[PDB]
Amino acid sequence: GSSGSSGEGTVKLHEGSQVLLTSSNEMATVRYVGPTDFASGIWLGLELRSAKGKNDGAVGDKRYFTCKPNYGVLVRPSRVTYRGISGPSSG
């Protein structure tokens, strides 16, 4: 399992994407994408439009985004979700 070897890879996140938390039920804009220095694993620098997080834009010696105190949050793809299908345009 590395860069798509065993177990497929449905990781489609680079930037300017939208994902909804599967715990707090709050949309979040994807700013950063990749491994972190404070933790061991992949993360996604999210940024909310209000004080509903636990980050100050950056954590440690790595910048993920820029926002007010406790505005954005850091979560993993598997920890986040987002639509993709199109479906009937009418409605």
- From residue 7, alpha-carbon distances to 40, 55, 81 in Å are 20, 32, 19
Domain that holds residue 45: 1-91
What CATH code is carried by the domain that includes residue 16? 2.30.30.190
Nearest one of 68, 29, 34 to 52, comparing CA atoms: 68
Contact (Cβ atoms closer than 8 angstroms) between residue 73 and residue 28: yes
State the Cα–Cα distance between residues 63 and 45, nearest whole angstrom: 8
Contact (Cβ atoms closer than 8 angstroms) between residue 68 and residue 52: no
Q: How many domains does the chain have?
A: 1
Q: What is the DSSP string of 31-48?
A: ---EE-SSSSSEEEEEE-
Asked how this structure was determined, the answer is NMR
What tokens appear for 32 in the block?
């950063």
